[PDB]
C-alpha cells in the first residue's frame, strides 16, 4: 500500500525521469529458470569469468552462485548485464574459464570439476540474455530526485531512494527512512539504480521506506 504518485506529492518531490538511467524504458523479460548455468565475471575477482548457477529469480534479476563456491557470496545480476553471458562465450572468444575465489576443493582439481559440472547441465540459452541498454551521454540527475535502488549492503533488496548530491559523473544515493550507513555513491549510469515504477513493471518487490 505504498504508491509513487502519492509519495511524491506528499514529499513535494519528483522522480528521476527514465532517461537519466542506463536501464531500458521497457524493462527486459527474465525467462531464466533456477538451475540454469551461465558464465559470470567473478564479483570478487573481475579479471575472472567463472561458471555460475541460477539460485533464484526475482524480477529482471538473477541470484547467482559461482559453481564450486560456498553459499555465502551469492550475487544478483540483471538479465541485461554485460557481466553475464551464455556458457561457451569464453571458449568462443578464446578466453579461459577460471575457478572462483571461494573455491572449496584443492586447486589442482579444477579441470576435473569443470568437466563434472558442465556435463548434462541446463545451459541458459543465448536468447535469454538481453541487449545492454545504452549509456545516457550526460548526468541528468538533480538533487532530491526520487528513484528505486539496490541496497548495496543487502542487494536482494530494492528500496525507495533519493539523490542527495550530484558531482560530475557521480550521484550520492540515500535511502528514505534509513541512516547514512546505507548511503552510497555510484556513477549516474550504474545498473543498481532504477526509475520509479521498475519493480511494478518487472514484478520485483519494492521495499517500503524505513519510517
Amino acid at each position: 500500500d505504498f504508491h509513487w504518485e502519492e509519495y511524491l506529492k506528499e514529499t513535494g518531490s519528483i522522480s528521476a525521469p527514465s532517461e537519466c538511467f542506463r536501464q531500458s524504458q521497457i524493462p527486459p523479460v527474465n525467462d531464466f529458470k533456477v538451475g540454469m548455468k551461465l558464465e559470470a565475471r567473478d564479483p570478487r575477482n573481475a579479471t575472472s569469468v567463472c561458471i555460475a548457477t541460477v539460485i533464484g529469480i526475482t524480477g529482471a534479476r538473477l541470484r547467482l552462485r559461482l559453481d564450486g563456491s560456498d553459499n555465502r557470496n551469492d550475487f544478483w545480476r540483471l538479465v541485461d548485464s554485460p557481466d553475464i553471458q551464455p556458457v561457451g562465450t569464453c571458449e568462443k572468444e578464446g578466453d579461459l574459464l577460471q575457478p572462483p575465489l571461494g573455491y572449496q576443493m584443492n586447486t589442482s582439481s579444477w579441470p576435473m570439476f569443470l568437466l563434472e559440472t558442465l556435463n548434462g547441465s541446463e545451459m541458459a540459452s543465448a536468447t535469454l540474455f538481453k541487449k545492454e541498454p545504452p549509456k545516457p551521454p550526460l548526468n541528468n540527475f538533480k538533487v532530491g530526485m526520487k528513484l528505486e535502488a539496490i541496497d548495496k549492503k543487502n542487494p536482494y533488496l530494492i528500496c525507495p531512494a533519493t539523490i542527495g548530491d550530484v558531482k560530475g559523473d557521480e550521484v550520492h544515493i540515500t535511502f528514505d527512512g534509513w541512516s547514512g550507513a546505507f548511503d552510497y555513491w555510484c556513477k549516474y549510469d550504474s545498473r543498481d539504480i532504477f526509475p520509479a515504477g521498475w519493480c511494478r513493471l518487472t514484478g520485483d518487490v519494492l521495499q517500503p521506506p524505513g519510517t
Binding site: 541496497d151 543487502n154 536482494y156 533488496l157 527512512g177 521495499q207 517500503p208 524505513g210 519510517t211
Partner: peptide, 8 residues
C-alpha cells in the same frame, strides 16, 4: 502502534 522496520 509502530515499531521501526528491520531489513528482510
Amino acid at each position: 502502534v509502530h515499531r521501526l522496520l528491520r531489513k528482510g
